Every structure is written in structure tokens, then in C-alpha cells.
Amino acid sequence: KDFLPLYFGWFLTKKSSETLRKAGQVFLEELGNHKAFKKELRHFISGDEPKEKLELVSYFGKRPPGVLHCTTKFCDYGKAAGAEEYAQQEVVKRSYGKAFKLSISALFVTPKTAGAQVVLTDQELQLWPSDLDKPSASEGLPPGSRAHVTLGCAADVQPVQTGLDLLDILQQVKGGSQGEAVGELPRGKLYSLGKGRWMLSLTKKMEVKAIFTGYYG
Ligand SMILES: [Cl-]
8 A cells, every 4th residue: 555645735945945944033033132022031931941031043942954844734644634535636636746935924933833824825725635623723714824834843842833823823813913013023013912922924925935745754
């Protein structure tokens, strides 16, 4: 029997991966120095940290090696639920190796993860899986809302958490967030969502080039 990839997704080109990685790092630096973030630090960490400055680049140390990616379907070589159905789809086979542009609308941080929110085109949405275990933070969010690029994770967090963290952030702002920004960073408006959750809504969306394919460990 033929096994499947570990996961399907869009793998950023080297240059797009470097552009987004650098924007993520700049965000972490700017956020950690922002007055609003600093005065909410005890909502973010929970230990015996001193009354000194947290460097978010250190905090989010488990950064992807190599290129960045946006996962569609985690397959675990066929062991994940829904893997075989996903992979057999015409659209997946037709798209395999195709180039796409991914639109990044926002960067976000929680105490667990840092990531970029991806807003998929209608063509890209056809590659989004139709799975069976709906996260409660996805209630009243449209399919494909979880799409993201992981930028870093805290030490004991697994990268999958980044999509759950995005969904939870999106739940906070689903009714609209006009007038609610706590402040601004150079590239957009900064939102403080409580419980260590922060979102930079980009003034101008970023656009990265990627290729749809399957990754094998
Ligand atoms: Cl979703």
C-alpha cells in the first residue's frame, strides 16, 4: 500500500519565506516593546519572571526551520482521520505542484504561539479540507478561517496549536472590531484581545508565493 504525505499544504518560496519570517520577527520585537503589551505582561506569562523585559523572539524560540508553510490537511501518512478522502480529491491531484499567492491579513501572538493569518482565495478554499472534528473556537467562522503560517511556538507547545489560537482570536473579533484597536504599529492596528492574545491587522495585506505539495519527514 502507498502511503500519503505527512501533510499537504502551500510551501513558501525561499524569498517569500524570508520576507514573511522577517516581518514576523519585526512584529515580535515591536510588540514586546509596546507599552500596552508591557503593562499586560502578567496576563501573558505566569511564572516567577522578574519585573524586567520579555523578549518575544526568545519566547517563541521554536521557529520553523527552512521555509514557512500553510498546511491544508495533516495526514500523518494516512493515519489521520479524513486523510485518504482529502488526498483522493480531484482538486488536490490537479493542484499538486501548482503555484499560488497567499494573502496575509494579520499577525498574531498568544502565550502559546505566534503566527500569520492567511485569507484564502476561492480557488485556494477548494483545497481546504472538510473535516469531522470542528474546534469550538470555529463556531460561526467560515471554512478556511484556520488557515495560517506558524512563525514560532513556546517551548512546550506543538505547532498545530497555532491554528487553534488563530480560531480563538477570530472568535473574539467576529462581530467586527472597528474602533477597538489599543494602538498602532508601523504596518497596522494593534488589538489586545485579553488573556495574552494580540493581533496586528495589516493596513495592506502581504502576498507570498507558495507551491501546493506534500511534505514527507
Ligand atoms: Cl477553518
